[PDB]
Amino acid sequence: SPYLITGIPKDPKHPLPIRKDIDDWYLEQTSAGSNRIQLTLFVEALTVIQNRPLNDQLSYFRLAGIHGAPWTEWDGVPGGQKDSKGNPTGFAVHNNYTFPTWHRVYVTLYEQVIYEAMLDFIKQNVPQNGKADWENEAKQWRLPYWDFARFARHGGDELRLPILVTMPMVKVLVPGQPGKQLSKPNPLYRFQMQTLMGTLERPYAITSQKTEEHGWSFDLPFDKCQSTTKYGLLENYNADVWADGGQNWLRANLALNEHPWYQNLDGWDSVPTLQDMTFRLLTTGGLNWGEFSSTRYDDKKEKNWMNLEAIHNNVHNWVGGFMFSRPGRHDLKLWGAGHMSSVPVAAYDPIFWLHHCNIDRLTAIWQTVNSGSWFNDDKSKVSKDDDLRPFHRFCEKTRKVVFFRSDDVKDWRSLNYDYAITKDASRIRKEISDLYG
Amino acid sequence: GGSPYLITGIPKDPKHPLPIRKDIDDWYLEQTSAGSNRIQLTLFVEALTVIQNRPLNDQLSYFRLAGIHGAPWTEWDGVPGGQGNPTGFAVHNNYTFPTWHRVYVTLYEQVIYEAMLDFIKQNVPQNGKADWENEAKQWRLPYWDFARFARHGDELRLPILVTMPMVKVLVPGQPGKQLSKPNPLYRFQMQTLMGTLERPYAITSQKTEEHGWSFDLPFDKCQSTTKYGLLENYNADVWADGGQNWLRANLALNEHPWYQNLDGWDSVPTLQDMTFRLLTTGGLNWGEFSSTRYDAPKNWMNLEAIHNNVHNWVGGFMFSRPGRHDLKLWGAGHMSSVPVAAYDPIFWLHHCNIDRLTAIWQTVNSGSWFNDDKSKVSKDDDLRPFHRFCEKTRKVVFFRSDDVKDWRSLNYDYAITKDASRIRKEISDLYGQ
Ligand SMILES: [Cu+2]
Ligand SMILES: [Cu+2]
Ligand SMILES: [Cu+2]
Ligand SMILES: [Cu+2]
């Protein structure tokens, strides 16, 4: 501490490596041969990170803890912040125009920590004769994104959670034994502690989290979970079920394709699918940064398009499960609650980061086709210079440790990653239409 | 060694008269309450774990016991398999459906009891063995009451314990010490995909028909049993372990999408009401009650047909993508496919309740046993592969239906049939609308 966030260091041999679609990447790794070095690196590194203890601020628990509960210090920056309701809240920015830029830095922190763990894995497990090859793959690797708006391919018609997120086990290579493979628990499937999260040592215990459903208050029992869950917490179920409510990925996929938007869409031209809503986000002209970036711009919406943060909020609900209390009979098919729908605990679910990797990509796409729209309308200009706590960087012009600011990450390529879709500005509008139109 | 495995039920101890098979939710909630010693839950979990980890050449391994029902259609207890469509020992669509399965459930219960006794000998402090043995002697295979609304501190549900990936058990001799272990009731898995097991045990894909088209359900591509986790056009690495999608099973039980045509019925009954009608409709013979073979009647369904629907609703019965309105129930899994349903540990709990329903119906229809024109012909079929000792000729023979007419001869009962005076009131309390 401080942990200086840079993105993966620049290697002349590896100019601006790309964050790939995680389904494309999984099939590249597994389909056409056992080309599984990056998959092995990612699984083994994330496993190590998840098994680090609470007193290591680069453990998975503590990195996820930056976002929300248990609302503690990170990297020497104190907790104790409050939200608009006066409740304890995390460092994460929601309902402000820095929502995309705070999360841009957060995703880069996760990616960097993973890369550093990959290098340690290679130094510890790859024989001399394999080091350059394994190192080359780590240097090319970037955090994959989940394209929640792209139809899943068949070997498609359906939006889906990532293939790899739905697999309890994953097959990895044994370095030093070419040809040998092992099946291991998949660290992208879920995250769990070794006890119920409500009983962790102080100050890290996860409390229940109060949420409103149909205008009434419910205390979502995240203190009673050992594992993250998608849809597995239901009111008036035995708490031994809540300890690990499962990865109910079929219900998440149903919700993605039924797209039950929480906003009032009365008066809209149509009720768009998630793909169409995403298409409209990327192609609606004449929008400013404030309107694109946040639910703050127009309180009342919470004109036939929806901002980035609002879309993102719905996808959180649809992945995690947003109904703890039993609904009416006509809505029983989507009953259940889980981590991704609750801001205080969403970052514990490993899909959180893949979702935010695509939110970062959507931001980069929109920036590409809306050059100059950046914290400069009358509403968003005040936030431009906010410190993006708790994220530290080394300033080269002043030789100081400072917090990140939004202008530091306007060009995502300064963090040494890119997206295929943003490589060629002549192609981007066509690619948006191909994927989402 | 040329030693047939006699199926007797748990042996009789005069100080343990006719122990009862309990509702698995009541039993689990009792076992996990502070007023319980938790020993039966520990014993069941530890014993069933041992049984699941026995090797394939052990005919009392979980895999081989489940294999009696259907695929991979091998021998068991020296009785040849490989029975031109391949088929297993299980009786379906005949009037011995309930009695074949009565013996099968007893075999499972008895093997578990014997593994409990082994566990006690090897793991329990000497001074505790008597107490643990007495708990084993009280234990009987719990039933899943698929027609009873779950306790909620009106919804039918899979058992609590079936929906838990992990379960906490006692460490013998260490009060307060519990340890969390993989729950053997949650699923069954092998150490490789089931389609690659050593010959002759490999589990193949299995045909099914959906909307007039044949599909291969990819059970050969599964390492674990699944509920709803097999969907067409999903990467086969998902199929390795498609998950225990218990919310979708619960939805199916409460939406009750019967496979039968219900044209001209007075109402579409819920699963609870159909079960109520099974137990309370008078004037039916054994053949009408016992099997789909008899046929159809309206406003009533026979035991085997209710049981078939429950199999579908638990396992998932739609591999290929259905229409918009049915997407909420999309997905296929073991319990809907006869050749592989017995691998899912809930199979046995479902069949325990089908045995209980049979016992209840027998109690209130005591004159109807294999003695209508249709079912009489099946009465003396050998219930292969199950062996018993005949206490007259001093020989081992195959079970026959009449041997198990009185389920108490196998040294178990149900609370609801033990208290026969109350039975009609209890049926109304549990299942009446
Ligand atoms: Cu956030
Ligand atoms: Cu988010
Ligand atoms: Cu059967
Ligand atoms: Cu059955």
Euclidean distance between CA atoms B292 and B304, whole angstroms: 6
Which two three-digit tokens encode residue A268?
């809209």
Which two three-digit tokens encode residue A176?
């030093």
Please tell me chain B's helix, strand, coil percentages from 3-state DSSP, rounded to the nearest 5.
40, 10, 50
* End-to-end CA gap in chain A: 46
CB half-sphere exposure, A159, CA atoms < 13 A: 24
The amino acid that residue B196 corresponds to is T
Which ligand sits closest to the CA of B94? 3
Residue A192 DSSP code: B
- The single residue listed with the structure tokens 């026995």 is B54
Euclidean distance between CA atoms A278 and A291, whole angstroms: 15
Q: Do residues B349 and B143 touch, judged by C-beta distance below 8 A?
A: yes
Helix locations, A270-409, DSSP H: 274-283, 289-293, 308-320, 351-369
Euclidean distance between CA atoms B120 and A330, whole angstroms: 50
Q: Do residues A392 and A2 touch, judged by C-beta distance below 8 A?
A: yes
Interface of A with B in 226-285 (CB under 8 A): 227, 231-232, 234, 236-238, 240-241, 243-244, 246-251, 254, 257
Contacts A25 to B, Cβ<8 Å? none
Q: Are strands B178-182 and B395-398 parallel, antiparallel or unpaired?
A: unpaired
Which ligand sits closest to the CA of A317? 2
Length of chain A equals 437
b/e burial code for range A343-359 (CB count within 10 A of at least 16 → b)? bbbbbbbbbbbbbbbbb
Distance from CA of B348 to the nearest CA of A (A): 21
Euclidean distance between CA atoms B112 and B141, whole angstroms: 9
Euclidean distance between CA atoms B248 and B250, whole angstroms: 5
Question: Residues B239-244: contacts with CB within 8 Å, 24+ apart?
Answer: B240/A167, B240/A169, B240/B193, B241/A167, B241/A168, B241/A169, B241/B189, B242/B331, B242/B333, B243/A166, B243/A168, B243/A246, B243/A247, B243/A248, B243/A249, B243/A250, B244/A246, B244/B162, B244/B163, B244/B165, B244/B186, B244/B187
Euclidean distance between CA atoms B309 and B275, whole angstroms: 12
Distances A32 to A29, A133, A145, A184 between C-alpha atoms, Å: 7, 18, 21, 21
Which ligand sits closest to the CA of B146? 4
The verdict on whether residue A154 carries a ligand-binding annotation is no
Euclidean distance between CA atoms A157 and B399, whole angstroms: 53
SS3 of residue B208 by DSSP? strand
The CA angle A212-A218-A219, to the nearest 5 degrees, is 125
Euclidean distance between CA atoms B364 and A404, whole angstroms: 77
Cross-chain CB nearest to B238 (options A163, A231, A326): A163
Provide φ and ψ at B113, rounded to 5°: -55, -45
- The single residue listed with the structure tokens 């309740």 is B353
SS3 of residue A216 by DSSP? strand
Q: Are strands A169-173 and B206-210 parallel, antiparallel or unpaired?
A: unpaired
The verdict on whether residue B311 carries a ligand-binding annotation is yes
Reference B4, options B394, B384, B400, B396; nearest CA is B396
Which two three-digit tokens encode residue B124?
């329990």
Helix (H) or strand (E) holding B216: strand B213-217
Length of chain B equals 433
Euclidean distance between CA atoms B312 and B390, whole angstroms: 38
Distances A35 to A22, A152, A171, B185 between C-alpha atoms, Å: 15, 21, 11, 36
Contacts A167 to B, Cβ<8 Å? 237-238, 240-241
Q: Do residues B29 and B40 touch, judged by C-beta distance below 8 A?
A: no
Q: Do residues B242 and B333 touch, judged by C-beta distance below 8 A?
A: yes
Residues 6+ apart with CB under 8 A from A2: A75, A76, A392, A401
Provide φ and ψ at B180, rounded to 5°: -85, 125
Distance from CA of B233 to the nearest CA of A (A): 5
Q: Do residues A401 and A2 touch, judged by C-beta distance below 8 A?
A: yes
Which two three-digit tokens encode residue A305?
């398009």
Q: What is the CA radius of gyration of chain B?
A: 21
- The single residue listed with the structure tokens 């009465």 is B379
Provide φ and ψ at B209, rounded to 5°: -110, 130
Compute, in angstroms, the gap from residue B349 CA to the centroid of ligand 4: 10
The verdict on whether residue A339 carries a ligand-binding annotation is no
Compute, in angstroms, the gap from residue A120 CA to the centroid of ligand 1: 29
Provide φ and ψ at A369, rounded to 5°: -100, 5
Q: Are strands A400-403 and B166-170 parallel, antiparallel or unpaired?
A: unpaired
b/e burial code for range A365-401 (CB count within 10 A of at least 16 → b)? bbbbebeebbbebebbeebbebebbbbbbeeeeeeee
Which two three-digit tokens encode residue B403?
């041997």
Euclidean distance between CA atoms B356 and B362, whole angstroms: 10
Which two three-digit tokens encode residue B303?
């035991």
Which two three-digit tokens encode residue A218?
């419910």
Euclidean distance between CA atoms B380 and B259, whole angstroms: 31
SS3 of residue A256 by DSSP? helix
Packing angle, helices B423-431 and B271-280, rounded to 10: 160
Cross-chain CB nearest to B247 (options A155, A169, A336): A336
b/e burial code for range B397-410 (CB count within 10 A of at least 16 → b)? ebbbbebbeebbeb
Bridge partner residues of A183 (DSSP): A171
Euclidean distance between CA atoms B191 and B189, whole angstroms: 7
Cβ of B293 under 8 Å from any chain A Cβ?
no
Q: Rounded to the nearest 10 degrees, how much is the dihedral formed by the CA atoms of A389, A390, A393, A399?
A: 80
Euclidean distance between CA atoms B339 and B220, whole angstroms: 12
CB half-sphere exposure, A221, CA atoms < 13 A: 22
Compute, in angstroms, the gap from residue A231 CA to the centroid of ligand 1: 19
Residues 6+ apart with CB under 8 A from B355: B98, B101, B102, B105, B143, B407
Helix (H) or strand (E) holding B32: none
Euclidean distance between CA atoms A334 and A258, whole angstroms: 10
The verdict on whether residue B334 carries a ligand-binding annotation is no
- The single residue listed with the structure tokens 């959507």 is A362
The amino acid that residue A347 corresponds to is A
Is the bond into B125 cis (omega within 30 degrees of 0)? Answer: no
Which two three-digit tokens encode residue B48?
């069933």
b/e burial code for range B92-102 (CB count within 10 A of at least 16 → b)? bebbbbbbbbb
CB–CB contacts below 8 A, A to B = 81
Euclidean distance between CA atoms B61 and B20, whole angstroms: 25
Closest residue in chain A to residue B324, using alpha carbons only: A258
Residue A223 DSSP code: G
User: By what technique were these coordinates determined?
Assistant: X-ray
Which two three-digit tokens encode residue A5?
């966030």
Reference A277, options A103, A148, A430; nearest CA is A148
Which ligand sits closest to the CA of B311? 4
Compute, in angstroms, the gap from residue B304 CA to the centroid of ligand 4: 8
Helix, strand counts (H, E) of chain B: 13, 8
Q: Rounded to the nearest 10 degrees, how much is the dihedral formed by the CA atoms of B67, B68, B71, B76?
A: 90
Please tell me chain A's helix, strand, coil percentages from 3-state DSSP, rounded to the nearest 5.
40, 10, 50
Compute, in angstroms, the gap from residue B227 CA to the centroid of ligand 4: 15
Q: Are strands B331-332 and B166-170 parallel, antiparallel or unpaired?
A: unpaired
The CA angle B348-B352-B353, to the nearest 5 degrees, is 125
The amino acid that residue A255 corresponds to is A
Reference A238, options B164, B165, B166, B156; nearest CA is B164
SS3 of residue A323 by DSSP? strand
Structural domains of chain B, with CATH: 1-433 (1.10.1280.10)
Euclidean distance between CA atoms A302 and B149, whole angstroms: 39
Bridge partner residues of A323 (DSSP): A336
The CA angle B225-B231-B236, to the nearest 5 degrees, is 70
- DSSP per residue over A125-182, as a string? HS-GGGHHHHHHHHHH----B--TTSPPP---------TGGG-SEEEEE-TTSTT-EE
Closest residue in chain A to residue B329, using alpha carbons only: A333
Residue B364 DSSP code: H
Closest residue in chain A to residue B150, using alpha carbons only: A237
Q: Do residues B144 and B314 touch, judged by C-beta distance below 8 A?
A: no
